[PDB]
Amino acid sequence: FKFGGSNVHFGAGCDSCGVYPIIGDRYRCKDCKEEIGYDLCKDCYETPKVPGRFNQQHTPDHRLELAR
């Protein structure tokens, strides 16, 4: 069981705006390798391109997936 479903992502924060936890849809990078990962809120996914809050090497060619 997961409380909130995909409406809330505890422990996950947006690497552009810094909201924590991400409320609503979350877009996770799949090619960024750092274990901290790279995530975006739906607003920052829609209006795009920060390099990262924690030294993540996110490139414009990286692909993002919706995290259910």
Strand partners, 27: 40, 66
What's the CA gap between 67 and 3, in Å, rounded? Answer: 15
Q: How many residues bind Mg ion (CB under 5 A)?
A: 1
Three-state SS at 55: coil
x/- mask, Zn ion, residues 1-40, rule CB under 5 A, reads -------------x-xx-----------x--x-----x--
Beta carbon nearer to Zn ion, 9 or 14: 14
Residues in the chain: 68
Binding positions for a second copy, rule: CB under 8 A? 1-5, 8-13, 15, 28, 35-39, 52-54, 56
